[model samples]
Target: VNSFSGYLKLTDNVYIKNADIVEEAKKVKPTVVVNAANVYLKHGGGVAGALNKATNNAMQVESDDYIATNGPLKVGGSCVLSGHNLAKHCLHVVGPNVNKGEDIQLLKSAYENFNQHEVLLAPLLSAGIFGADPIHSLRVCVDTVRTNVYLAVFDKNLYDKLVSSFL
Candidate 1:
């Protein structure tokens, strides 16, 4: 956690808040849940159920009729990265456009409702095409997919950078 995001100053326009993950996920009606956490708190209970739900939803992406070429984003869906508690859904907004406030809420929700299992799945790196820096990328993914997440990567250089971000 300390190694993932950069440090915050009292007046740095940076602070932390929390929220409800299950309720938010339900409201978003998202298809994927990306868990990006550095460590998992309680793995057997709520975390287990949450991961099951997300993975199950991901499974449906391949077989469901509404998920074909004519469906939503076609082949693109979301997942849960059990590193951080920031979950988000894929968005329809165009890049280089006006900024959307969606990502912030995702981070908040993930942290508030994070679990032990999620943290253990630490260092959850972002996939290709939907490029994002470890912190921002994971943040956005969780925001879009409505899942908790931890910024991930095994590379030493990348890891160092990510760690240095917070402190």
Candidate 2:
């Protein structure tokens, strides 16, 4: 059987695939899995929620502990913590809320800060409930990521749009 599920390479080490992000994280086992987090680093919903579930709520507990110890993170801010499963480390990044009038620069910064790792797995942060333009947010990651990446996209339409850029 032929499948395009594991598709195009955007750079020497980056890729985009149409699949459940959590599943890809388990399969690819990258160095760090980026959690699209909230200001408080709470793993309540969206990408954070799924990732928390993937890590059996250990990530949530650690994130809450991190906030308690170091205060909260703002849009475009990031911090890393050790991961128990899926990957070795979790890079939590706060994304801009376009609904709150935040701009792409913050989204760009969030993407920019993720460049430190050797392998990163991230979703299109801020493109769902936060309402940032998907392509704009996607472009920021595609443009700045120096680490090997697996951009696991859940939306078929967005996945189509993403693959078209490279194919």
Candidate 3:
């Protein structure tokens, strides 16, 4: 979190896990934060349960956004996807361990929340523990989203659109 205040630090590993919530938020200086949840594998794919019982302790640099973090419960092993579908703009990550159900909530969330503006960053979906096919991983992440889904595998125009469509 640079002094600019709007500047935020996004530690994928730390955020996913719930270890250092307060401390991390302070460092990032972001009014809103999203975590991956439980790096050590805590919770049962957290999600469905966390929403109802989450803490709103992080400070707000701005009223527009609040600090939010996810747990490893949703992801684990290698892929981090935690058997759940891509986390919208970002894939759930954990995989290699086992295939979990996919959810379209990610795209809906990102669009509604505006989390995915331009560059949708995430770990190599296939690199995780489950180690599923790379093509399948890409398909799940992009196909599910409702934005202008484009790929550069063949067409340069589509690739450019995907690469340069962010705000």
Candidate 4:
């Protein structure tokens, strides 16, 4: 058990908080869940992987549906699709992979690209396998999102780093 499991408010409605993305996917009424996805929009790793499996591979169908017509996602690009059993909609976004390039602006651009929705649930973009520093990603997410943003994070150490940075 731990004591630091609450939200760090950035705006009147925007917040960074500790949460299991899969758990959030398991419940919602027309909710919006954001997946830090890849150029292929394949839900084989990271948050996308967990949510896909947790929701019984239905999420895979959703992503495939989007890509079939829209083509591949690029770095700092986004695609929206029906969330199937997870939520009302899912936003699949590709963050800049720092190993392949200098990615500060691209990661920032990724956050900036999201269309305003009354509510959006996303992770700390680019901070995981995409390799943007978690705190840097957190600040960008906090700064850019004008709507209510719920930054759902679950890893204990990673979550602590974000909370520490926010404080």
In order of appearance, the predictions have TM-scores of 0.29, 0.88, 0.26, 0.86
Local error of candidate 3 at residue 65 (angstroms): 22
The TM-score measured for candidate 3 stands at: 0.26
List model 2 lDDT by residue over 9-107, tens digit each.
Answer: 777766777777788778766678888887888787788888899989998888888889999998898999876687778888888977778776877
Task: Supply every candidate's count of residue pairs whose N, Cα or C atoms clash at under 3 angstroms.
Answer: 55, 0, 40, 0
lDDT of 4: 0.75
What tens digits encode model 3's per-residue C-alpha lDDT throughout 12-124?
21111122222333343332333323233332323312311232311111111311243232333211121112122222223333344443233223222212433222222
Question: lDDT value for candidate 1?
Answer: 0.32
Who is ahead in lDDT, 1 or 3? Answer: 1
Best by TM-score: 2
lDDT per residue (tens digit) for residues 111-165 in model 1: 3333322322222322222233455634443444323433334345654554456
Query: Which should have the higher lDDT, number 2 or number 4?
Result: 2
lDDT for model 3: 0.28
lDDT of each: 0.32, 0.78, 0.28, 0.75
RMSD of each: 13.1, 3.4, 14.0, 4.0
User: Residue 146 of candidate 2: its Cα lDDT?
Assistant: 78
